[PDB]
Design a protein around this ligand. Structure first.
Ligand SMILES: *C=C(*)C1=C(C)C(=O)N/C1=C\C1=NC(=C\c2[nH]c(/C=C3\NC(=O)C(C=C)=C3C)c(C)c2CCC(=O)O)/C(CCC(=O)O)=C1C
Length: 135
């Protein structure tokens, strides 16, 4: 387990910038509102913070897999972002999708690298997505 968990975070840490850029690209296809006025990536300032946020979530997921699970992540802190995002008009369902997309992009690269029987990787993506979109 521990060796594969390290091997996974190596792949994610190596392919960190591309996994985000690939995930945000497909996110804007399915949610084109984000690149329109009102959306959370209309301006360059907002877009930069949008890829920054996605990088934070993938970052948390890599550590969570290396650490042994999503228990390490603080549920109050993630629930703090839920309230902030609602207040600042960042919609929660697209935020959830972006994480679940980043799960999918990571799952491809691990399979293309060679790894199979990779269910444990899902946990912190599905956990952060669950606590973000709870209401
Ligand atoms: C839409 C694109 C983005 C989705 C995918 C998303 O997750 N957020 C959207 C982008 C924006 N985020 C903004 C402000 C903001 N985000 C966070 C989230 C974190 N900050 C952290 O340190 C961590 C974990 C280490 C997370 C998860 C916070 C706290 C904030 C507010 C403070 C700040 O960092 O600026 C904004 C700006 C909204 C506005 O204009 O007020 C966008 C856009």
């Amino acid at each position: 387990d521990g060796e594969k968990r390290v091997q996974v975070a190596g792949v994610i840490g190596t392919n960190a910038a591309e996994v985000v850029k690939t995930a945000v690209s497909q996110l804007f296809q399915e949610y084109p509102e984000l690149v329109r006025p009102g959306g959370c990536a209309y301006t360059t300032r907002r877009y930069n913070m949008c890829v920054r946020d996605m990088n934070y979530f993938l970052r948390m997921c890599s550590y969570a897999i290396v650490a042994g699970g999503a228990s390490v992540l603080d549920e109050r802190m993630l629930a703090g972002f839920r309230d902030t995002f609602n207040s600042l008009g960042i919609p929660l369902c697209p935020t959830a999708r972006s994480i679940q997309l980043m799960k999918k992009i990571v799952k491809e690269k691990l399979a293309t690298a060679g790894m199979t029987n990779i269910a444990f990787v899902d946990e912190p993506f599905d956990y952060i997505a669950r606590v973000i979109s709870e209401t």
